[PDB]
Structure 1
Amino acid sequence: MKVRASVKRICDKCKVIRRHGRVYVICENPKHKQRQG
């Protein structure tokens, strides 16, 4: 998914970085691109 309210870390490689308040998740596979919005 893309924009959740609760953002998990469903991988081991999903970094949980935070770019201007929004708790993103980046990865190497793109399906894990969470946003917390």
Structure 2
Amino acid sequence: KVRSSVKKMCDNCKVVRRHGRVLVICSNVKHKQRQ
């Protein structure tokens, strides 16, 4: 969502690279981190 400025929720929410892209991931709809 935040497109710009993502940084680790749940004590897990991972750091993944898709299309060089960095989009938050972690066992929660409440983390759908993306930029």
Task: Output the TM-score relative to the length of structure 1.
Answer: 0.70
Report runs of 4+ in structure 1 exceeding 4 Å deviation: none
| Structure 2: gaps of 5 or more residues | none
Counterpart secondary structure, 1:9 = coil
Task: Output the TM-score relative to the length of structure 2.
Answer: 0.72
Bigger helix share:
1
Give the corresponding residue for 2:7: 8
Q: Distance in 1 between matches of 2:15 and 2:34?
A: 10
| Structure 1: gaps of 5 or more residues | none
How many matched pairs? Answer: 35
1:30 counterpart = 2:29? yes
CA deviation vs aligned residue, 1:1-37 (integer Å, no higher than 9, x gap): x23301110221100101112211111111201111x
Identity fraction in percent: 77
RMSD (Å) for aligned C-alpha atoms: 1.2
